[PDB]
């Protein structure tokens, strides 16, 4: 098992090293772009399918001034 706590230990360090280096040194921006691309799966732009255009039809004031009104006090 040597090889393995060996390979283990030595890289583990390695690794953890080049992390608190990189992110201490913050020069790893690379890394972080990269991750926030593949995080953001919201690439895509918005897409418009409830009709949130202008123009407020006598629903949406409806419900608007009948959702205001009736709330609560203070």
């Known amino acids: ?12 360090r390695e690794l953890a090293l080049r992390i608190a ?3 201490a040194e913050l020069i790893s921006d690379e890394a972080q772009a ?4 593949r995080r953001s799966l919201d690439s895509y732009p918005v897409s418009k399918n ?4 202008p123009k407020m ?11 205001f009104l009736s709330r609560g006090p203070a």
């Open 50 to 53: 409830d009709g949130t255009r």
């Open 34 to 37: 990269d991750l926030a691309l």
């Open 21 to 23: 280096q990189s992110e």
């Open 1 to 12: 098992q040597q090889q393995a706590v060996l390979e283990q230990e030595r890289r583990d």
């Open 57 to 67: 039809t006598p629903e949406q004031m409806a419900k608007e001034m009948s959702e």
